Structure 1
Amino acid sequence: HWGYGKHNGPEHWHKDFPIAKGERQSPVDIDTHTAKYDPSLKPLSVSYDQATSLRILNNGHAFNVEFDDSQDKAVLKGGPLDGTYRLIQFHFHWGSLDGQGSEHTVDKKKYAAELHLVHWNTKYGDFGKAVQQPDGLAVLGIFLKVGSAKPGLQKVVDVLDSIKTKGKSADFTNFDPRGLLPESLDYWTYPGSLTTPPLLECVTWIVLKEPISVSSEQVLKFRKLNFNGEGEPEELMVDNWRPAQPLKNRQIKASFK
């Protein structure tokens, strides 16, 4: 099965998922000098006040904080998007070292980690149908740098001991994802894909320019998770990022000058 090892990592994925070599794969390097300011892009609307978190899950490649997406409780609209996209989950990608971990890069710079807030287009009725459409998902990507702690991340960090291994879940109610946002909503946007198998080309990526700061202790706790299940040999959950893919025939647009 796929993973992030030498024998099953990103360079192998194309054998089971040939779309790995497709025309709109993610992540990509964001060349800030060639990204085009698009003055017709709208401000993003992030409406998370009624968000209902439910659970946190170690799925063997990351941990997902899951939300009730059975109503328009936490939605992303505006920006490059047409219509309303509902928050279903968030997760992170991170490194073994502070110098790597992000999936997107900025002028080839790698951040320590990257947060993905995943939303699906309500016109398709549910997530499974949405991922079969070219405009099915909107993923808000936020870079993490190591410095001062992010207070709003700590509740996540503190529950990780209860989901150390693959397949473990825990209740995770009343978590406010607003506490994970930077001050500015300036962004880059481009059409792309899931960054994990099945690598479906269904994502409008919205990557924020401003990183959030997390502490060394916070990201160290991410690195204590396991890819393996309980009672299997311990494999630390680190370097669960796909490297940048060819931009091909795409333009990255900026919401800001």
Structure 2
Amino acid sequence: HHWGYGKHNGPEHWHKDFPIAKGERQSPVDIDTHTAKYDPSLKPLSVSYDQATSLRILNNGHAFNVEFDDSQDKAVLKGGPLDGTYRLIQFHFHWGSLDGQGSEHTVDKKKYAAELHLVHWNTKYGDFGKAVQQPDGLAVLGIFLKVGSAKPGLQKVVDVLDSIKTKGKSADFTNFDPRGLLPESLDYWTYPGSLTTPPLLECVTWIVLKEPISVSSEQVLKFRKLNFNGEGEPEELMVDNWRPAQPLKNRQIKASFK
């Protein structure tokens, strides 16, 4: 049946409809920091979000996506391990029922409270649906969230969530600046992997930032009041929407820093 994160349709079941789930380059993974190799051949990341145009925020039943206008090169990622230009299409988060879990990537087996994914697609493939069919189709910027001080730039997101509580609800969400979600440092780890939700396609260059951002308990608590279900269905809190770490297999994680 339809996939989700419960006991009967969670990540351990996905391989039955999506056999690539047991593939050779599945995400997320544990980042073993001692084994990642510094690659001095790696460039600095180029995040150019000055002209970003957010449009809408949507509860899609798994997460909430903040969507952007990607019909022009307004918000792009380049540099780092990437060839070419990748356009921002949406960002979303993965989070836990408790502060001790929620991220998808782990760092020396450490789990963070949440993980932000800024999803970008390679403009050489013309649109997102074509890009996910290519091994270099997507570039996803992963940022860990730890609980501590509030993230001022997150509050506009937190405050609209009660308007999209249930699956299928959307709201206008313009003039949101995703630069306010970035940590100070852009040091990163990178490896080839996959989408972390079905269809689990192996099309992603992952770029995971070393430095987490901090958010407050109140901010993450508001994530946890969302619902997986549709309006007028039994309430299932949207929590623990993370896939756990998958086998690294024949892959090397590279680090941009020493």
TM-score, length-normalised on structure 2? Answer: 1.00
Counterparts of 1:42-57 in structure 2, within 5 Å, are: 42-57=43-58
Counterpart CA distance in 1 for 2:207 and 2:193 is 10
SS at match of 2:11: coil
Counterpart CA distance in 1 for 2:158 and 2:7 is 28
Task: Give the deviation of 1:243 after TM superposition.
Answer: 0.2
Q: Point out 4+ residue stretches in structure 1 off by more than 2 angstroms.
A: none
Counterpart CA distance in 1 for 2:236 and 2:180 is 30
Counterpart CA distance in 2 for 1:138 and 1:241 is 19
Provide the identity percentage: 100
For residues 24-65 of structure 1, the C-alpha deviation after alignment (integer angstroms, 9 at most, x for no partner) is: 000000000000000000000000000000000000000000
For residues 226-245 of structure 1, the C-alpha deviation after alignment (integer angstroms, 9 at most, x for no partner) is: 00000000000000000000
Task: Give the deviation of 1:82 after TM superposition.
Answer: 0.1
Counterpart CA distance in 2 for 1:245 and 1:220 is 27
Task: Give the deviation of 1:248 after TM superposition.
Answer: 0.1
Task: Give the deviation of 1:104 after TM superposition.
Answer: 0.0
Task: Give the deviation of 1:139 after TM superposition.
Answer: 0.0
Counterpart CA distance in 2 for 1:256 and 1:71 is 32
Task: Give the deviation of 1:249 after TM superposition.
Answer: 0.1
Structure 2 residues without counterparts, runs of 5 or longer: none
Task: Give the deviation of 1:113 after TM superposition.
Answer: 0.1
Task: Give the deviation of 1:125 after TM superposition.
Answer: 0.0
For residues 89-129 of structure 1, the C-alpha deviation after alignment (integer angstroms, 9 at most, x for no partner) is: 00000000000000000000000000000000000000000
For residues 157-180 of structure 1, the C-alpha deviation after alignment (integer angstroms, 9 at most, x for no partner) is: 000000000000000000000000
Q: Does 1:62 align with 2:78?
A: no
Structure 1 residues without counterparts, runs of 5 or longer: none
Counterpart CA distance in 2 for 1:64 and 1:11 is 24
Counterpart CA distance in 2 for 1:23 and 1:193 is 10
Task: Give the deviation of 1:83 after TM superposition.
Answer: 0.1
Task: Give the deviation of 1:23 after TM superposition.
Answer: 0.0
Counterpart CA distance in 2 for 1:195 and 1:127 is 16
SS at match of 2:118: strand
Task: Give the deviation of 1:190 after TM superposition.
Answer: 0.0
TM-score, length-normalised on structure 1? Answer: 1.00
For residues 189-212 of structure 1, the C-alpha deviation after alignment (integer angstroms, 9 at most, x for no partner) is: 000000000000000000000000
Alignment correspondent of 2:73: 72
Number of equivalences? 257
User: Aligned Cα RMSD in Å?
Assistant: 0.1
SS at match of 2:200: coil
Alignment correspondent of 1:128: 129
Alignment correspondent of 2:25: 24
Task: Give the deviation of 1:18 after TM superposition.
Answer: 0.1
Counterpart CA distance in 1 for 2:220 and 2:137 is 31
